[PDB]
């Protein structure tokens, strides 16, 4: 139903995680975390799923 994805580079966009995790299952959404001031990514992200099987 979701996933945390850590150990990422700030140049890794959401499309890299999409090319990894959409072969796993139905990606509902992806968001890469940034700082609210620097507009620089924080090295991790989140991929919301919808099913438990694709999450496992």
């Amino acid at each position: 139903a979701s996933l945390y994805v850590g150990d990422l580079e700030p140049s890794v966009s959401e499309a890299h995680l999409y090319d990894i995790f959409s072969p796993i299952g139905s990606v509902s959404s992806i968001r890469v975390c940034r700082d609210a001031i620097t507009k620089t990514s924080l090295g991790y992200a989140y991929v919301n799923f919808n099913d438990h099987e694709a999450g496992r």
Partner: protein, 52 residues
């Protein structure tokens, strides 16, 4: 008479030069160094959203 005072951001005694870099050309004696420097304002932009 500048609305900017002397002591701004590790520098002081801000006195200007000729108009249009009627400012953005400031003679400044330094606090951290103690050395005559020039400053330019860029007094028109206001957005620098990425410190990156």
């Amino acid at each position: 008479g500048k609305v900017i005072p002397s002591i701004v951001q590790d520098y002081f005694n801000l006195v200007p030069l000729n108009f249009n870099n009627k400012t953005t050309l400031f003679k400044v004696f330094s606090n951290y160094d103690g050395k005559a420097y020039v400053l330019k304002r860029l007094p028109n932009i206001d957005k620098s959203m990425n410190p990156n």
